[PDB]
Amino acid sequence: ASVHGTTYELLRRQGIDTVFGNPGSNELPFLKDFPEDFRYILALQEACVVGIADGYAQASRKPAFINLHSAAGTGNAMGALSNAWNSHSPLIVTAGQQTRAMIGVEALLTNVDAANLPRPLVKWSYEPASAAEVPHAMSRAIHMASMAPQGPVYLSVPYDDWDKDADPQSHHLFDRHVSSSVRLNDQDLDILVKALNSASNPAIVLGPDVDAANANADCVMLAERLKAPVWVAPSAPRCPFPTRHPCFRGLMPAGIAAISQLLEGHDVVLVIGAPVFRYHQYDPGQYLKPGTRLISVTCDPLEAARAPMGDAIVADIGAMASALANLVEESSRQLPTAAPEPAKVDQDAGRLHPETVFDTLNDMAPENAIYLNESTSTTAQMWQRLNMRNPGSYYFCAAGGTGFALPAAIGVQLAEPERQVIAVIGDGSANYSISALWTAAQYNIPTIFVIMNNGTYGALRWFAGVLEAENVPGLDVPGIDFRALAKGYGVQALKADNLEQLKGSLQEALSAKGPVLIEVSTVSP
Amino acid sequence: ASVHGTTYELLRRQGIDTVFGNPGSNELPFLKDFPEDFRYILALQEACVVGIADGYAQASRKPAFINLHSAAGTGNAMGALSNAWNSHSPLIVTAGQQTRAMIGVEALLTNVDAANLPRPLVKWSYEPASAAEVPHAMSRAIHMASMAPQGPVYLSVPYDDWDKDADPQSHHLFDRHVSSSVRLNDQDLDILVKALNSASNPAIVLGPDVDAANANADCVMLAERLKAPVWVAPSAPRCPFPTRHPCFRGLMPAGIAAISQLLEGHDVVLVIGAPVFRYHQYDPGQYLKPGTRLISVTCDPLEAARAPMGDAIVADIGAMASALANLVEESSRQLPTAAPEPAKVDQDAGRLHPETVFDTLNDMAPENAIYLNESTSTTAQMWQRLNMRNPGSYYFCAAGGTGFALPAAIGVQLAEPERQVIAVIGDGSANYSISALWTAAQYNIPTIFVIMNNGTYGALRWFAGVLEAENVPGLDVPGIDFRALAKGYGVQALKADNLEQLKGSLQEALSAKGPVLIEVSTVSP
Amino acid sequence: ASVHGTTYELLRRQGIDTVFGNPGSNELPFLKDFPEDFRYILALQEACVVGIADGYAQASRKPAFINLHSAAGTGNAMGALSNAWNSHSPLIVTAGQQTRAMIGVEALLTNVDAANLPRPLVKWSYEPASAAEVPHAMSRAIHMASMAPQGPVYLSVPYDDWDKDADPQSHHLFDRHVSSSVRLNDQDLDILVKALNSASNPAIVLGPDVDAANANADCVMLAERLKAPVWVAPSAPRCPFPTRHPCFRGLMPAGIAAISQLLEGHDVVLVIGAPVFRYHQYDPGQYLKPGTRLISVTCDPLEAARAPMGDAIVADIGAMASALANLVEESSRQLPTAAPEPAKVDQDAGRLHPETVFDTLNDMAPENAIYLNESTSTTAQMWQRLNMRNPGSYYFCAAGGTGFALPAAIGVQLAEPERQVIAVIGDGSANYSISALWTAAQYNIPTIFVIMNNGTYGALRWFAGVLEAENVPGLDVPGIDFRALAKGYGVQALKADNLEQLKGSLQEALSAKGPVLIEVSTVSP
Ligand SMILES: Cc1ncc(Cn2c(C)c(CCOP(=O)(O)OP(=O)(O)O)sc2=O)c(N)n1
Ligand SMILES: Cc1ncc(Cn2c(C)c(CCOP(=O)(O)OP(=O)(O)O)sc2=O)c(N)n1
Ligand SMILES: Cc1ncc(Cn2c(C)c(CCOP(=O)(O)OP(=O)(O)O)sc2=O)c(N)n1
Numbered sequence A, B, C: 001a002s003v004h005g006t007t008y009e010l011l012r013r014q015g016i017d018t019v020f021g022n023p024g025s026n027e028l029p030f031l032k033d034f035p036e037d038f039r040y041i042l043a044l045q046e047a048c049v050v051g052i053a054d055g056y057a058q059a060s061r062k063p064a065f066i067n068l069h070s071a072a073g074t075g076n077a078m079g080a081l082s083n084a085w086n087s088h089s090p091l092i093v094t095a096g097q098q099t100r101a102m103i104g105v106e107a108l109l110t111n112v113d114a115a116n117l118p119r120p121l122v123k124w125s126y127e128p129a130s131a132a133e134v135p136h137a138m139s140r141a142i143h144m145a146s147m148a149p150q151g152p153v154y155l156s157v158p159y160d161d162w163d164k165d166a167d168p169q170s171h172h173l174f175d176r177h178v179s180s181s182v183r184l185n186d187q188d189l190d191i192l193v194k195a196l197n198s199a200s201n202p203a204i205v206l207g208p209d210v211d212a213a214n215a216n217a218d219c220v221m222l223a224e225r226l227k228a229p230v231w232v233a234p235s236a237p238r239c240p241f242p243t244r245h246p247c248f249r250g251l252m253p254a255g256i257a258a259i260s261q262l263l264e265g266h267d268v269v270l271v272i273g274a275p276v277f278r279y280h281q282y283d284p285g286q287y288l289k290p291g292t293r294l295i296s297v298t299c300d301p302l303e304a305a306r307a308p309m310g311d312a313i314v315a316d317i318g319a320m321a322s323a324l325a326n327l328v329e330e331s332s333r334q335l336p337t338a339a340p341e342p343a344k345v346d347q348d349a350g351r352l353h354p355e356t357v358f359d360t361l362n363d364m365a366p367e368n369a370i371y372l373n374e375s376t377s378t379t380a381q382m383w384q385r386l387n388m389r390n391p392g393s394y395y396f397c398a399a400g401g402t403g404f405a406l407p408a409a410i411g412v413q414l415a416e417p418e419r420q421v422i423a424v425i426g427d428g429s430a431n432y433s434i435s436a437l438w439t440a441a442q443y444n445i446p447t448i449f450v451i452m453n454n455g456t457y458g459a460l461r462w463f464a465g466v467l468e469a470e471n472v473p474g475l476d477v478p479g480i481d482f483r484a485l486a487k488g489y490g491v492q493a494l495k496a497d498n499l500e501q502l503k504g505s506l507q508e509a510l511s512a513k514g515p516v517l518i519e520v521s522t523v524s525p
């Protein structure tokens, strides 16, 4: 067998059947004779390729396979890799290298010092020392991406390797099963459970690895047993809990002092599947108030090491959430009372308040919709106004890097063909990965894109006001016609200048058979 | 509080009470006002510092703390770090940096691009962005070294940081408890146990992480229940099993074909706490023969990813060994029969065969002796001839790097003051870290050093014969007087030119109140 | 031809005829069939291998070739590489890798992520993608080490590559000539010369790259023409000027304020072949006083970029010094007056003051002696008391890393067989690379080693007094018998407890036919 044949057999035997890619010269010997059982999803720029693959991996809860061109293609994807690192996304990033005989001379298209290029944003990065090693290196990449804590990996392959003879012993790779589905030993788990059972006023904080594990329902059981309020850890990349469950208390503010104040009076705070904590604004004060202790369950040693407070347990979130939910006592305390619905903001017949947009989406979208957020000044209102009952219902750029949601929404829609995806993206953020629209059109992936057009980088403008910063340049983005951009890439487009038009546009979009972009005129901040 | 006071409080609260070091100018602000409850162990070169700390950490089963001088001191230690990486040794390596105000100009003693220097041989490498961050960075280092898979970490600290004010919120670091003591979920563990129970001819292979976990006795129970032969994985850094137990079958040959032949006819091979596998010679063939499947339990994702065959489970070795030992059925098969004792090799009244040396050590040493091996051509005979009943009884350079055993034997003896340590080191290997002898003399650490003097790099000479390689230079090391070197560093020294003198020297050494070096004239290969 | 044959042909065609090494398993396929026209110099530990090669390269003014074993051997050498980086030493560091077929599994002796290991201490670091690339990669290593700014480079070679067929087009590598012997363009050089000619009170500062270029005599002509005092830049690794020439003013203090005060009243300060500046103690103040401007000529862009003041020219030091010496006008100012001889320090019939030692060496050594310094508390007195008339007469660890001088003195003596080398090394520093003594004995390289034994790390103790630091541990090194260590490695040894014995020992040592170590009892600080 050839290295080509052996590698595609390994991929299919390990459950991989889709290549997200943007091709080049070094990759044609890999992509030729493309197997009939595989799908190739083309995107027009590599940030888009990786964003689409990332949304697909996050929603599918399985690794996604990517093929990019050498250094320039890998480089174009590295902002997308920063988000993927923070979201623990299992991405197998492959890139083609020059033929081994011209690597030394640094021929055009040589990826120099290739494995160092995507560092520090990958768990493992490698270029094999010979063609016959390629299947084994691919096996390593698959497992490294997939073991907890999941994350992106990188493999560079000289183009001449694919046609070489494979090692016959590579067949031992095909069916390897690798598990990290582990939980705390019984003795120590009993100690943890007793601490939870004897807490007087416990609180629960959940992060994105809960949703990645599909541990959401176990966390609901846990919260109901403990009678405990539940918050989502700050800077949330995913939604780990039903947002209208009576225990839910919303998105935590991303500040040190704000969080310790919020937790004051809670004697035990159990954090599951989050860093402790992804603060953002610098809000100095106590990490925890006297009387509060913290216990973190995390899949990632790096998170356990860097927490500034609390105990930690490094284990699989699915296994730990299930064990805790099933072992804790039912507390006789009263179940928390649901948060009240948000107020309606006054809305005239002109430009839309973001609150109106979210309320209207909540009114009209299916109950199993999936939302993506890259409307950076409106995140708090989004979290208050969307009833997200099911797992896998929310994605936000985990490193804060814009350019994620537009492509990721396409990948999520590909992963979840029966759940309507609605990406709510600011006019600023929409440009970073605008060409991803073309992939939705070409493959007829029916994502709905809601562009919140207020003419400015509002989250930045707000922060400039916060620092009392005068004369900051570059904050306004006038003069973009999103309906024309959508037409450019073959996506149906609508415009909503007021609430009547927003309702009419959403009705059409929800009825449509393909992707749709709605440009919404929103209030300037 | 100062950063100095806060950092020593963190260290003591995390169980650290000893600094292994070789000082410099950038480290004096850390070492000043040295706390009365801490011990400083000086060694004269940094390979020695780290080797001593490594033996201490491996035998104690807890992290060891190291302080080195800037780039040159760190650099002198990097061969020792290669061994520590392979042995999963929890080493906290700190080095002093120039004052922040002259880092930019690259004053003498600046460690340029410091965190990159020890890569790729550390799990985590860092220099803090401000003085107040130092305690938090130290906390990260402690936990990163200590979580599974354990390993060395690196922290560079500008010398001016120590006298600065600490953050009052650093007190939350002091008592953090971080656990990685995890095992496979119940459902999947039951599947594994059923596979073991239904095996017709199981085999067990154990590696160094068994001994690191003190899982040895659980592995004995497991082997007795399953009625299974037990081998030690190749290139063994530790001894994970009693070597005269009836199930024991010795050290596996470090070759692909040799191992698959050895395992032929075993239907299930359970590997615990080893890479799969640390081969050495290139002995191409089948990874496993038809009819054999492999299951690996490893604490290290990197090991699970790179195995060329078998299933894997990434979990804590202590927790997994205990769970398996207690869950498997007692098989009705007959217990394996003990291996026969090794034959006595003919020995005249002249230079010693290595086999004679090992038999004599086995005859005379206490039953709880601890051996170290850096006599590289005699490892197979050592493994056959020493009855090692207890855990923590054997250490060998895990990366194959010479210069480990002499210093490590001192650290092991410091960790285990009631167990006599006997380091068996070739005349070649003894030179790499020869100055470590001084630390044994100064602190009166009563290690016995047995120098196997055959005048040559025998393991290399043997391999040159294997490749039929003529005219290889640099293989002979004549003209070293080890008794004079021992005198140079204050260690009592003896010479044994024949068996009568070997017995007499060992009797004296075993009676002595301090370290002793015995130079043994061994047969030339 | 094989890769082996082609690579040795490239080496000999590029002037390389000596391999400094410590062998291992991965290197035997390179070292076998060792060519008859090459020399192999064995040392017993890799810090020693690289130190010897470094002294040889620095004194020869040509690249030196090194062969080490995999990661552990490379790692053992990295403190030596820190010094080599600072001294711009042209070192070609090669290390053997595992056979390509087991790199993936990480067999014992695999150097993982090899090229990253010696970073950041090398100019270029590489492992070739195929066997046929090895000669081209070796060519790159040779030229990268040798082009300005010279420095160490690293090449990792899988052991199976050597026996493979070479590319017939590799013959084009053999005779390549690469030059960096460049100087500032005529127009700008004329501007510089006019600035020097019109200076009212110029000063010259010289660094180690002057001595590396053998630009010393040109710098003497330049100083005589300009009538300018000459200082050596701080932390000096080499001696760039005759120390009793009337212009010489000695070693600059390694402090910011001290240097600006020293230069006050000099209108133009021309620095040649030094960083600006290798400060050590933090002595904050003005970089230059009003009225002084600085112009630096450096071979190293990194030095030009990081200077905190002055203009810079990046060019070859040999070419620039020759051009300036020959173009400047003869000033009509009076030639500077020679510094007075140093005073005799009072000396009783007991332990030796360092000043006595240096005065006695100056009295007894040949005029063409070469000194090395690793007596770290006595550097200022050494610089005052040794008349060094010739180039290549002084070496000091350029990164401040101890363990350089003992091995380097052997390499220097090998490079300069007709100049007596005298290494003055403290009792502390002597231990770092003590095993290098064996190479001097085995090859009969007649270096004289003068061990200044005061029982302590005096340079550190002095600095602790400076910070008023109480309770610093690890500063004393009692209990080392250097005559026994010398006997251990086959070197003749003498002891000098007083001046009479010092004179008698030096007389013997100077008469001896082999290496000699003299242990000198010096006054405790
Ligand atoms: C790749 C990238 N570039 C720039 C930014 C900075 N950035 C920018 C440019 C933001 C403004 C996005 O504007 P928007 O129109 O999408 O939404 P708002 O008006 O609601 O903020 S928020 C933010 O952090 C970023 N996070 N990531
Ligand atoms: C740091 C380092 N340098 C060199 C080697 C190479 N090496 C060397 C030099 C060996 C010979 C050791 O000789 P010995 O006298 O200690 O023992 P034997 O004579 O029994 O081999 S075995 C081996 O792998 C190494 N492994 N590690
Ligand atoms: C590799 C390394 N380790 C440690 C040091 C720190 N160091 C040490 C240990 C010195 C003392 C050397 O003592 P000595 O006996 O050689 O000489 P003095 O007594 O004259 O200082 S000076 C100095 O910077 C260093 N520079 N390099």
Ligand SMILES: [Ca+2]
Pocket (backbone or CB within 6 Å): A359, A362, A363
């Ligand atoms: Ca509503």
Ligand SMILES: [Ca+2]
Pocket (backbone or CB within 6 Å): A426, A427, A428, A452, A453, A454, A455, A456, A457, A458
């Ligand atoms: Ca906007």
Ligand SMILES: [Ca+2]
Pocket (backbone or CB within 6 Å): B359, B362, B363
């Ligand atoms: Ca016996």
Ligand SMILES: [Ca+2]
Pocket (backbone or CB within 6 Å): B426, B427, B428, B452, B453, B454, B455, B456, B457, B458
């Ligand atoms: Ca030997």
Ligand SMILES: [Ca+2]
Pocket (backbone or CB within 6 Å): C359, C362, C363
């Ligand atoms: Ca004199």
Ligand SMILES: [Ca+2]
Pocket (backbone or CB within 6 Å): C426, C427, C428, C452, C453, C454, C455, C456, C457, C458
């Ligand atoms: Ca001293």
Ligand code: NA
Pocket (backbone or CB within 6 Å): B116, B117, B118, B119, B120, C116, C117, C118, C119, C120
């Ligand atoms: Na490095």
